[PDB]
RNA sequence: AGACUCUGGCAUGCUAACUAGUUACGCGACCGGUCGGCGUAACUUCUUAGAGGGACAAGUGGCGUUCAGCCACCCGAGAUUGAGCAAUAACAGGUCUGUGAUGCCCUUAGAUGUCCGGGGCUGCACGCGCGCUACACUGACUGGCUCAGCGUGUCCUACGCCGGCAGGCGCGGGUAACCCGUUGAACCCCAUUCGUGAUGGGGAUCGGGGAUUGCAAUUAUUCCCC
């Protein structure tokens, strides 16, 4: 019965890690949390007041699945149709600074290190926290 | 055993008319959990009489320019409509579809005979395969118009129109559109 | 013209610095893979260069 | 002497494999360690063009293609053997690239 | 959910017929010079729940909403959220509201007419001023 | 004690690996119930419910689908699981079990065991796609 | 010191149409009537060993009106690999 | 007149990099890229024409073919003939005039007047 | 005719919410918006409170179609 | 015409891979499970691309002037795709404006030659053809999830740093299944909000600012933000 991150519902994974960082208290909150977009192809504001936390949860599980990926790769994860108006839509990448200040703050919380052969990967320390939240939400799903 | 969406049984569904015995879909053998089988049912003629009717409704309901390829967004509407039909009728929701396509399937229709610009109709009867095919599209178009311009959703409208067609009431678009064809075929015979 | 002002315009950027190596014409140029051939002189030397219209 | 690499490249396979089966046969009678010719993918240089040289016709197009087949054959032998194997079976239309160490 | 006995239906703030029978986020879109984005940022700086409707606000809430949009810089609003950046006359960062939009637009139109520019003449003639093609379009508004 | 087969649709290609085990069928690490189109989850459930858990209790399946889109991926897992169990009960188990499993799956659906022979038609000039053409006018 | 030119004779001069088509050009340029030199080339390459051949000369042959002239004998394959 | 919080005197006596600091993006890019050799000879000539003018009489019209010139605040009041393609035009260079390009003031086309269409 | 609805509750609407809703046999925000002349968002927000009070069973919840059933 | 040639569906038979992949073992890392996370044993199922095989109205039942062949069925991957090439005879069809192809020519020194500066080809009352966005609820917003294929690239770009974006700086790789890239594409899948309102649908028009490419963006070149 080894609970793995891959054995847990990813949507239920990312909504069970934003509250984990709120009670932690330690996180680098940027100035542009209540201010800015998340991509150039975005027209409205995120509804959540804590969108920067689930962004970090999604980034953490993405580095868990496939490590050694930089900020330009996270621009390609969170891209989408850039409705160009009357012109047909196209592919657009995400913002390269919000994901930057997520990854750069992940070293501040000691899950992520800059590996010698490229971008950023996960330390063996945060895998424990990931499997703990995985086990607790898996028990919450499988028990009640 | 094999249920529709794992919960609805089609084995307790009875076909009423002899005219729709072999051209109707599943009674005992064509039972599938989902419509979405992605089989080839248009390669040869009379290969459409062997697909399940959930496939036929799913394929007919996706008819508009905005959603012409989408299908996984179409099976959920049918599933929700089936739940609503089971809520209202109190019994197996698939019998309601049969009783609705029986009362909506046209029997007599006209034929364009003459020159262009002046129609001179003559009544001919409706083939059973076309009888099966025609009743679904009218349901789909009525649901399209109604749920196109009200608050009421696609699944709720499809379910209510299907139940009113099973009852054979005149408040349903399916039972309405059989009547014009029937009475124009009455005028010629 | 005058020596200081005869080729005074730079000829690195713009399609007027690119001409076909066969006919010196600059409309319909194939710069893909460095052919630099006119699209109408290409159909002349396609068989000789080693191009085969297989399908 | 190790990791001596021979790369055959040409345009058609009716002449590529005729030579590719020749140098691997010369090394076999010399009792050397041979690695089989691994296929390195065919490149389809595809150029579409208008047939009409004035642009008046019914918009008909030519899909000209070049096909490039690549071969990689590996040996493990001193460098004087690969030269005498390559230099004898010279065939036009198929060309050889030799990388040492 | 509650039934507000004290529920003002139709607001009249800054001489604009504001509809309180809507979300507060998209009711401030109705005034000129403020769209969805600026209203959303202003209300997020005002710490107002977006679930709340426009007619559910208190008096001090309406007053602080008005005072935030007037001078945005001290209320943690960046300089690139504004309707006009550094202008020709003063070069001052300022957000333009409904009342200032009309007379600022007419003085912008009349600025280039004394200048006698290509854009000023194009504006004066009713033609497209952005280099646009009206050989086949622009039939609307013409004869 | 192991066989390796592949299932295929339009572009997706799932490879299964039948090692003897305890009954764990995971697709690239995540379980069967967990593939992102949830409705077609019932589609991913249609082999097992037709074959029973009692013949899956000694089999572990590792599905390695890499290609296709979001739906052609599921049918590759479908095909690979079905033909993987067929090959596993062919090489090591007597032919009668393979034949009855094959008969049951065939009388359910033929595409559950054989591959779709239809793939994309090449686009041609003068049209938007394969067979469609551009608009034409008259005098 | 890297190029070596070597002039060589054709294995069959008549059968190679690249060398042959430049002979009729020189024959027309020399002042011959078109039809006679075309028959000369035609019978030379028919006797050379070909299964079939054709020569099409087009232009202002006998007037300001441009007619077309065609000499076909033997076999021909106009389509197929 | 006041241009971006700045009157004409501080506009006239100020430096080139701060003049860049006042202008907008295209003008700043054009200043940072650098005025060219042909554009440098117009500056001295328009200084010469303004210098030899009477203090009451504004300096004479000078023809040029450089429609892409940004009007510096040192160019205010100098009459410059701008080529429209066929002829030259007389434009008055105002203190407000500095933010634009010369070519938009010498109109290249003629305003379109429409007549009855002939078999169209 | 034009459709004018109420974003918030009314005196008669909340009374109809308590006594009429558990006998519809179909409880849908569209039906509430049709019968009670209110916005469909308000119907969803009231049905969430009705679920929280434990008087209505939920059959299927989704982005668009949410299916409710009366208790027993 | 057909045959042919290329492409597609099939081969658990063949060829052989450190510039492709799997399995095993070991090393770890986490809680017997996961690792695109690391290395050597094999190995060619997945990936490559070459040979050979395979499908023919082949078998069966009807129809048949019981010939030629036509409907239906078993087995099979396929009972069969999509293109290239395309005869005789023609057209006053388009192209001298693709050629240092071209006959008669016109001009040839204030040139119909060359080059340069600027403008124009895009100018607008109106008409005619493609094409793209939409008209909203099967929808839009936001968050999360999760899969390709041609096929370019000495310019393609990874990664790190500053910026809200557009962008800028440094250090790299790749003349290429070696790097971009396991091409974390979109539609689609789940959740939130909006609920028939010219509405947040849809962004035509117009101001202001910012950055890049270019000698030169004035006739908004583009791209970004209200
Ligand atoms: Zn070329």
From Swiss-Prot, chain A:
Entries under Pfam families matching the protein: Ribosomal_S19e
Effect of residue 17 to P: In DBA1; affects protein stability; does not localize to the nucleolus; affects assembly into a functional ribosomal subunit
Impact upon substituting residue 61 to W: In DBA1; increased protein degradation; affects assembly into a functional ribosomal subunit
UniProt keyword Nucleus present: yes
Gene Ontology biological process terms, A to Z: antimicrobial humoral immune response mediated by antimicrobial peptide; cytoplasmic translation; defense response to Gram-negative bacterium; erythrocyte differentiation; killing of cells of another organism; maturation of SSU-rRNA; maturation of SSU-rRNA from tricistronic rRNA transcript (SSU-rRNA, 5.8S rRNA, LSU-rRNA); monocyte chemotaxis
Signal peptide boundaries: none
Modified residue annotations for N6-acetyllysine: 22, 110, 114
Cellular component aspect of the GO annotation: cytoplasm; cytosol; cytosolic ribosome; cytosolic small ribosomal subunit; extracellular exosome; focal adhesion; membrane; nucleolus
Annotated SMART domains: Ribosomal_S19e
Keyword field contains Coiled coil: no
Keyword annotations of the record: Acetylation, Cytoplasm, Diamond-Blackfan anemia, Disease variant, Host-virus interaction, Methylation, Nucleus, Ribonucleoprotein, Ribosomal protein
PTM annotation (N6-succinyllysine): residues: 142
Cellular localisation: Cytoplasm; Nucleus, Nucleolus
Membrane-spanning segments: none
GO molecular function: fibroblast growth factor binding; identical protein binding; protein kinase binding; RNA binding; structural constituent of ribosome
Entry comment describing in which tissues the protein is expressed: Higher level expression is seen in the colon carcinoma tissue than normal colon tissue.
Omega-N-methylarginine: modified positions: 66
Consequence of changing residue 14 to F: In DBA1; affects protein stability; does not localize to the nucleolus
Top-level taxon: Eukaryota
PANTHER family: 40S RIBOSOMAL PROTEIN S19
Swiss-Prot record, chain C:
Signal peptide: none
Entry-annotated residues carrying N6-acetyllysine: 47
Entry keywords, A to Z: Acetylation, Cytoplasm, Diamond-Blackfan anemia, Disease variant, Endoplasmic reticulum, Metal-binding, Methylation, Phosphoprotein, Ribonucleoprotein, Ribosomal protein, Zinc
GO biological process: cytoplasmic translation; translation
InterPro entries noted in UniProt: Ribosomal_uS14, Ribosomal_uS14_CS, RIbosomal_uS14_euk_arc, Ribosomal_uS14_sf
Keyword Secreted belongs to the record: no
UniProt-annotated location(s): Cytoplasm, Cytosol; Cytoplasm; Rough endoplasmic reticulum
Gene3D superfamilies according to UniProt: 30s Ribosomal Protein S14, Chain N
Source domain of life: Eukaryota
List of residues that carry Omega-N-methylarginine: 11
Database matches in PANTHER family: 40S RIBOSOMAL PROTEIN S29 (PTHR12010), SMALL RIBOSOMAL SUBUNIT PROTEIN US14 (PTHR12010:SF26)
Subunit: Component of the 40S small ribosomal subunit.
Protein role: Component of the small ribosomal subunit. The ribosome is a large ribonucleoprotein complex responsible for the synthesis of proteins in the cell.
Protein name stated in the entry: Small ribosomal subunit protein uS14
Gene that encodes the chain: RPS29
UniProtKB/Swiss-Prot annotation, chain G:
Compartment(s): Cytoplasm; Nucleus; Nucleus, Nucleolus; Mitochondrion inner membrane
Family under the similarity heading: Belongs to the universal ribosomal protein uS3 family.
Positions of post-translational N6-succinyllysine modification: 51
Location of this fragment in the whole protein: 82 to 162 of 243
Descriptive protein name: Small ribosomal subunit protein uS3
Residues modified to Phosphoserine: 23
Highest taxon of source: Eukaryota
Crosslink position(s): Glycyl lysine isopeptide (Lys-Gly) (interchain with G-Cter in ubiquitin): 9
Subunit-structure text: Component of the 40S small ribosomal subunit. Identified in a IGF2BP1-dependent mRNP granule complex containing untranslated mRNAs. Interacts with HNRPD. Interacts with PRMT1; the interaction methylates RPS3. Interacts with SUMO1; the interaction sumoylates RPS3. Interacts with UBC9. Interacts with CDK1; the interaction phosphorylates RPS3. Interacts with PRKCD; the interaction phosphorylates RPS3. Interacts with PKB/AKT; the interaction phosphorylates RPS3.
Post-translational modification: Methylation by PRMT1 is required for import into the nucleolus and for ribosome assembly. Sumoylation by SUMO1 enhances protein stability through increased resistance to proteolysis.
From Swiss-Prot, chain H:
Cross-link (Glycyl lysine isopeptide (Lys-Gly) (interchain with G-Cter in SUMO2)): 94
Compartments, record wording: Cytoplasm
Gene Ontology cellular-component terms listed: cytoplasm; cytosol; cytosolic ribosome; cytosolic small ribosomal subunit; focal adhesion; membrane; nucleoplasm; nucleus
GO BP, one annotated term: osteoblast differentiation
Keywords in alphabetical order: Acetylation, Cytoplasm, Isopeptide bond, Ribonucleoprotein, Ribosomal protein, Ubl conjugation
GO molecular function terms listed in the Swiss-Prot or TrEMBL record: DNA binding; MDM2/MDM4 family protein binding; RNA binding; structural constituent of ribosome; ubiquitin ligase inhibitor activity
Main location: cytoplasm
Keyword Glycoprotein: no
Record text on subunit structure and interactions: Component of the small ribosomal subunit.
Family, per entry: Belongs to the universal ribosomal protein uS19 family.
Function: Component of the small ribosomal subunit. The ribosome is a large ribonucleoprotein complex responsible for the synthesis of proteins in the cell.
Name the record gives this protein: Small ribosomal subunit protein uS19
Organism per entry: Homo sapiens
Lineage: Eukaryota, Metazoa, Chordata, Craniata, Vertebrata
Residue range from the parent sequence: 15 to 134 of 145
């Amino acid at each position: 019965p080894g609970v793995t991150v891959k054995d847990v519902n990813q949507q239920e994974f990312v909504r069970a890690l934003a509250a984990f960082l709120k009670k932690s208290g330690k996180l680098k909150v940027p100035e542009w949390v209540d201010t800015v977009k998340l991509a150039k192809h975005k027209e409205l504001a995120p509804y959540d007041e804590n969108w920067f936390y689930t962004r970090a949860a999604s980034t953490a599980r993405h580095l868990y699945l496939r490590g050694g990926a930089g900020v330009g790769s996270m621009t390609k994860i969170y891209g989408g149709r850039q409705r160009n108006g009357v012109m047909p839509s196209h592919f657009s990448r995400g913002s390269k600074s919000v994901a930057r200040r997520v990854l750069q703050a992940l070293e501040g919380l000691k899950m992520v290190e800059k590996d010698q052969d490229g971008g950023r990967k996960l330390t063996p320390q945060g895998q424990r926290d990931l499997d703990r939240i995985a086990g607790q939400v898996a028990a919450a799903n499988k028990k009640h | 055993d094999i249920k529709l969406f794992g919960k609805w049984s089609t084995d307790d569904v009875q076909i009423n008319d002899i005219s729709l015995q072999d051209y109707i879909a599943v009674k005992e053998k064509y039972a599938k959990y989902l419509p979405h089988s992605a089989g080839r049912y248009a390669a040869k003629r009379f290969r459409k009489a062997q697909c399940p009717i959930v496939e036929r409704l799913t394929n007919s309901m996706m008819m508009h320019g905005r959603n012409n390829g989408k299908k996984l967004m179409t099976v959920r509407i049918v599933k929700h409509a089936f739940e609503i039909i089971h809520l209202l009728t109190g019994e197996n929701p698939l019998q309601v579809l049969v009783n609705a396509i029986i009362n909506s399937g046209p029997r007599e229709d006209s034929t364009r005979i003459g020159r262009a610009g002046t129609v001179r109709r003559q009544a001919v009867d409706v083939s059973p395969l076309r009888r099966v095919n025609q009743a679904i599209w009218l349901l789909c178009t009525g649901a399209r118009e109604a749920a196109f311009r009200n608050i009421k959703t696609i699944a709720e409208c499809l379910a209510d129109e299907l139940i009113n067609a099973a009852k054979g009431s005149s408040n349903s678009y399916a039972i309405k559109k059989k009547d014009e064809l029937e009475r124009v075929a009455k005028s010629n015979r | 013209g005058h020596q200081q002002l005869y080729w005074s315009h730079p000829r690195k950027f713009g399609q007027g610095s690119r001409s076909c190596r066969v006919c010196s014409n600059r409309h319909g140029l194939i710069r893909k893979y460095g052919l630099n051939m006119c699209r109408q002189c290409f159909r002349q030397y396609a068989k000789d260069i080693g191009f085969i219209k297989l399908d | 002497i190790h990791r001596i690499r021979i790369t055959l490249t040409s345009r058609n396979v009716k002449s590529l494999e005729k030579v590719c089966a020749d140098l691997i046969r010369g090394a076999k009678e010399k009792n050397l360690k041979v690695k089989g010719p691994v296929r390195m993918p065919t490149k389809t240089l595809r150029i579409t063009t208008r047939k009409t040289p004035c642009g008046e016709g019914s918009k008909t197009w030519d899909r000209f293609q070049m096909r490039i087949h690549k071969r990689l054959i590996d040996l493990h032998s001193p460098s004087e053997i690969v030269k005498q194997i390559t230099s004898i079976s010279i065939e036009p239309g198929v060309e050889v690239e030799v990388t040492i160490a | 959910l509650v039934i507000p006995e004290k529920f003002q239906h139709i607001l009249r703030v800054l001489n604009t017929n504001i509809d309180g029978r809507r979300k507060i986020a998209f009711a401030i879109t109705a005034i000129k010079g403020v769209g969805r984005r600026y209203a959303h940022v202003v209300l997020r700086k005002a710490d107002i729940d977006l679930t709340k409707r426009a007619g559910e606000l208190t008096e001090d809430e309406v007053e602080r909403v008005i005072t935030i949009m007037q001078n945005p810089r001290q209320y943690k609003i960046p300089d690139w959220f504004l309707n006009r950046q550094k202008d020709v006359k003063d070069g001052k960062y300022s957000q333009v509201l409904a009342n200032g939009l009309d007379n600022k637009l007419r003085e912008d139109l009349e600025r280039l007419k004394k200048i006698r520019a290509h854009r000023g003449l194009r504006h004066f003639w009713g033609l497209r001023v952005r280099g646009q093609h009206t050989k086949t379009t622009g039939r609307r508004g013409r004869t | 004690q192991s066989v390796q087969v592949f299932g295929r649709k339009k572009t997706a290609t799932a490879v299964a690996h039948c090692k003897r085990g305890n009954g764990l069928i995971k697709v690239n690490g995540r379980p069967l119930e967990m593939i992102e189109p949830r409705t077609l989850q019932y589609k991913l459930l249609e082999p097992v419910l037709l074959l029973g858990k009692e013949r899956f209790a000694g089999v572990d399946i590792r599905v390695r689908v890499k290609g296709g889109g979001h739906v052609a991926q599921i049918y590759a897992i479908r095909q690979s699981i079905s033909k993987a169990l067929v090959a596993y009960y062919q090489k090591y188990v007597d032919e009668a079990s393979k034949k009855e499993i094959k008969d049951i799956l065939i009388q359910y659906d033929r595409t559950l065991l054989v591959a779709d022979p239809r793939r994309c038609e090449s686009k041609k000039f003068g049209g938007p796609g394969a067979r469609a053409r551009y608009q034409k006018s008259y005098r | 010191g890297s190029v070596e030119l070597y002039a060589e004779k054709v294995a069959t001069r008549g059968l190679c149409a690249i060398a042959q088509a430049e002979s009729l050009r020189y024959k027309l340029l020399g002042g011959l009537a078109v039809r006679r030199a075309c028959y000369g080339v035609l019978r030379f390459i028919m006797e050379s060993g070909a299964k079939g051949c054709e020569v099409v000369v087009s232009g202002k042959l006998r007037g300001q009106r441009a007619k077309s002239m065609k000499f076909v004998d033997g076999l021909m394959i106009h389509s197929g690999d | 007149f006041t241009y971006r919080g700045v009157d004409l005197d501080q506009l006239l006596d100020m430096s080139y990099e701060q003049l860049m600091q006042l202008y907008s993006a295209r003008q700043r890019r054009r200043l940072n890229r650098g005025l060219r050799r042909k554009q440098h000879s117009l500056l001295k000539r328009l200084r010469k024409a303004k210098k030899e003018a009477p203090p009451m009489e504004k300096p004479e019209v000078v023809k040029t073919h450089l429609r892409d010139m940004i009007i510096l605040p040192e160019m205010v009041g100098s009459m410059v003939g701008v080529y429209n393609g066929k002829t030259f035009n007389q434009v008055e260079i105002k203190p407000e005039m500095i933010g634009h390009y010369l070519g938009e003031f010498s109109i290249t086309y003629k305003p379109v007047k429409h007549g009855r269409p002939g078999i169209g | 005719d034009k459709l004018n609805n109420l974003v918030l509750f009314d005196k008669a609407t909340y009374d109809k919410l308590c006594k009429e809703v558990p006998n519809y046999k179909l409880i849908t925000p569209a039906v509430v918006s049709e019968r009670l002349k209110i916005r469909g968002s308000l119907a969803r927000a009231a049905l969430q409170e009705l679920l929280s009070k434990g008087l209505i069973k939920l059959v299927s919840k989704h982005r668009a179609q949410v299916i409710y059933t009366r208790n027993t």
